[PDB]
């Protein structure tokens, strides 16, 4: 075949409360409707929190300040390993009527 070491998309920058939890939405949309595209599980994660209570994000804000501090200090003896495991794996090709 080829030669592939690399891998496309990148990560970085720092984040927002609304990641901290888009982030454990996402597994709950993705699992219970698997069927759902990106496009569609994301519609709804940016409109969820527009609707959430302040109380709701209180503990998601608070997540999201550490990872930002930690961007900040980005202190030398603080690495991570790539995770990679699974993306989605979906088996549907039906968009609409």
């Not at 690399?6 to 698997?34: I, L």
């Amino acid at each position: 075949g080829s030669n592939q070491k690399n891998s496309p998309d990148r990560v970085k920058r720092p984040m927002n409360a609304f990641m901290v939890w888009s982030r454990g939405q996402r597994r709950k949309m993705a699992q219970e409707n698997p069927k759902m595209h990106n496009s569609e599980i994301s519609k709804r994660l940016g409109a969820e929190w527009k609707l959430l209570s302040e109380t709701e994000k209180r503990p998601f804000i608070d997540e999201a300040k550490r990872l930002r501090a930690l961007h900040m200090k980005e202190h030398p003896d603080y690495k991570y390993r790539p995770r990679r495991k699974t993306k989605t794996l979906m088996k549907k090709d039906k968009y609409t009527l």
